[PDB]
């Protein structure tokens, strides 16, 4: 299964300055486009190498559409300040996320259109892509306006249809990066302090996609009592990293075992000292 | 590809 998602952030600036507007498109865990309102270009720009293939017609059209989003938000920032009776002095953030999930069969699975004001859920499309869910009277005002203008209908068409076709096109034309699965290059490092304890670090480097599981075990028995896991982090080269640690008595080192589960592995791996 | 349909403000 794959997905395409667009992330739009627009931040109001008090007095002099138009709102900072940043837009980014992801296929799975791979960024392929950006638009920055403070960029010299004032153009949609590629991130992955595979989207660069696209002709002038795509970049003109994507720039045009994404500028309309930026103008839509500029007006939204205003309206919301008016709905919540807030100062012109105050700075505020809108965030818009939408996209589509497809199965293994590349057919439509889920669509979503979520919208936030100051890091808080404002209004969202339900699963059935017909009714809206508001957070407050202000979002309810937007809901009534969006019911009457038949918005759900217009967005659904994109989400069920065009979104899925964009995704297929990208998976197809960028097969060599997007449809690839890099196995995690796993190793293990030993640190300790006197006889107080010992610590093993279960490294897992240069892997895609990002979803992964690093567990520890003691005599084939899962251990979560004396472990330290970090959030999955990007190496920056398209791949991801992670490490789980564990604290043990000095001499028990061999008893402890780290299990790695990933999409691009045949069977879950297993490591000891 | 960015949503090509009608834009509605809140």
């Amino acid at each position: 299964s794959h997905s395409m998602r667009y992330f739009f952030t627009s931040v109001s600036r008090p007095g002099r300055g138009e709102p900072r507007f940043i837009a980014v498109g992801y296929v799975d865990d791979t960024q392929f486009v950006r638009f920055d309102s403070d960029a010299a270009s004032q153009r949609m720009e590629p991130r992955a190498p595979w989207i660069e293939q696209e002709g002038p017609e795509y970049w003109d059209g994507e720039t045009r559409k994404v500028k309309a989003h930026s103008q839509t938000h500029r007006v939204d920032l205003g309206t919301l300040r008016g709905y919540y009776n807030q100062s012109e002095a105050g700075s505020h953030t809108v965030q818009r996320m939408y996209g589509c999930d497809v199965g293994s069969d590349w057919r439509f699975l889920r669509g979503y259109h979520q919208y936030a004001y100051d890091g808080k859920d404002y209004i969202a499309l339900k699963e059935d892509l017909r009714s809206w869910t508001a957070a407050d009277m202000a979002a309810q005002t937007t809901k009534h306006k969006w019911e009457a203008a038949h918005v759900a209908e217009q967005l659904r068409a994109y989400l069920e249809g065009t979104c899925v076709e964009w995704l297929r096109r990208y998976l197809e034309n960028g097969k060599e990066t997007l449809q690839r699965t890099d196995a995690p290059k796993t190793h293990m490092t030993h640190h300790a302090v006197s006889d107080h304890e010992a610590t093993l670090r279960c490294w897992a480097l240069s892997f895609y996609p990002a979803e992964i599981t690093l567990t520890w075990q003691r005599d084939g028995e899962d251990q979560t009592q004396d472990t330290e896991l970090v959030e999955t982090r990007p190496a920056g080269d398209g791949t991801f990293q992670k490490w789980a640690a564990v604290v043990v008595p000095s001499g028990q080192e061999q008893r402890y075992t780290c299990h790695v589960q990933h999409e691009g592995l045949p069977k879950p791996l297993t490591l000891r000292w | 590809g960015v949503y090509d349909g009608r834009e509605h403000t809140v």
Partner: T-cell receptor, first 114, second 112 residues
């Protein structure tokens, strides 16, 4: 969506001005010509006021879009090969309305003769 | 062209059911419309169809879309002289041009 005239006959080398007006506040405006066998073909596309894009067949034609409610087609120098049915159209911008609902004018029969 | 219609013309007897076919290349795809056009006149919209809309029985007219195969049909049941007209298939690209892609049309002549 209206057009200047419904029938025109013109000598070659005349600068012909086919006008197209709409009071529907549309930003998008189109100049098409319909010849038998080929159907409609885009001459020029004005996306918003004071904008211009070359169509499939821009050669021999110019356009003015100084006001929003008027899109002006210009045969710089008239020629027999511009004897055609000329159709105007107008849609909204994505931000204004349904961007894909194209509204058509009645059409104009222009015969250019030497 | 990226929108082909077939046949380029057909002459059907009145009361016969007729089908007007339309194959498109336009990718990616946003909406398809079927226009009716009498001689000397503007095109008049019959149906618009998104991916999430297959079928519409608009009286004696029935429009059909298969977005996966990039194909649409316009069935007309029990044809009559008034159905005689040019039937245009128009498809909209999702790229950002907002310039629709026209088929060259099909001429339906219904003989009595």
């Amino acid at each position: 969506v209206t057009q200047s005239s419904r029938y025109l006959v013109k000598r070659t080398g005349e600068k012909v001005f086919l006008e197209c007006v709409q009071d529907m506040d549309h930003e998008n405006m189109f100049w098409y010509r319909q010849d038998p066998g080929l159907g409609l073909r885009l001459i020029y596309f004005s996306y918003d006021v004071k904008m211009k894009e070359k169509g499939d067949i821009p050669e021999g034609y110019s356009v003015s879009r100084e006001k929003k409610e008027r899109f002006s087609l210009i045969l710089e120098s008239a020629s027999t090969n511009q004897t055609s049915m000329y159709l105007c159209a107008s849609s909204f911008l994505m931000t204004s309305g349904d961007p894909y609902e194209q509204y058509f004018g009645p059409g104009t029969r222009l015969t250019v003769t030497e | 062209n990226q929108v082909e219609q077939s046949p380029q013309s057909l002459i059907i007897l009145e009361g016969k059911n007729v089908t007007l076919q339309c194959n498109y290349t336009v990718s990616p795809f946003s909406n398809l419309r079927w226009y009716k056009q009498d001689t000397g006149r503007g095109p008049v919209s019959l149906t618009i169809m998104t991916f999430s809309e297959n079928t519409k029985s608009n009286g004696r007219y029935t429009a059909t879309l298969d977005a996966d195969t990039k194909q649409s049909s316009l069935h007309i049941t029990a044809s009559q002289l008034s159905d005689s007209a040019s039937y245009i298939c128009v498809v909209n690209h999702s790229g950002g041009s907002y310039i629709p892609t026209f088929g060259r049309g099909t001429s339906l002549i219904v003989h009595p």
